[PDB]
């Protein structure tokens, strides 16, 4: 985390107006999970104003809102099982500063979304 500058994802099979594409974004209020299809750009920087991740949403099925995802490790597991998308999570402080430390902490599930779109690739937004 350090200075954050994170939060956002873009899943899906392709990235050009074909099939659908989750956008699990965070803005300190709502982790809105929109399965609406957009057209994307190279380096969309937003917040602080300028919102240009997207161009248009055409036809979509799902929507959602919840609470946000809260020298520390932010750690997730993204899994897809027969039309159910699951996102486990954990956020733990550490004292070591080099790499992933030696220890043990299980991940406690957060959500479960019935979508039904098969996914192949993803990339992270800032």
């Amino acid at each position: 985390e350090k200075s954050n500058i994170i939060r956002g994802w873009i899943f899906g099979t392709t990235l050009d107006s074909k099939t659908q594409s989750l956008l699990i974004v965070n803005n300190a209020t709502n982790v809105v999970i929109k399965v609406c299809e957009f057209q994307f750009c190279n380096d969309p920087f937003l917040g602080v104003s300028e919102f240009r991740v997207y161009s248009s949403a055409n036809n979509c099925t799902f929507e959602y809102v919840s609470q946000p995802f809260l020298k520390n490790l932010r750690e997730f597991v993204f899994k897809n099982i027969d039309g159910y998308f699951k996102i486990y999570s954990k956020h733990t402080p550490i004292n070591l500063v080099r790499d992933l430390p030696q220890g043990f902490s299980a991940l406690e599930p957060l959500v479960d979304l019935p979508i039904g779109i098969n996914i192949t690739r993803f990339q992270t937004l800032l």
Partner: protein, 50 residues
């Protein structure tokens, strides 16, 4: 061509709004359902729970 609706037409020539509902029973992660029963609670008695 335009319908012309007036208060005095009889029964067969009055507006009769229609709403058609179509359901899909295909194989997918179905999400829409109906309401559920919430019968009361008992304790210390041999019962069948669901």
């Amino acid at each position: 061509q335009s319908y012309g609706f007036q208060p005095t037409y009889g029964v067969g020539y009055q507006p009769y709004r229609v709403v058609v509902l179509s359901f899909e029973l295909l194989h997918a992660p179905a999400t829409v359902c109906g309401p559920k029963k919430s019968t009361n609670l008992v304790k210390n008695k041999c019962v069948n729970f669901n």
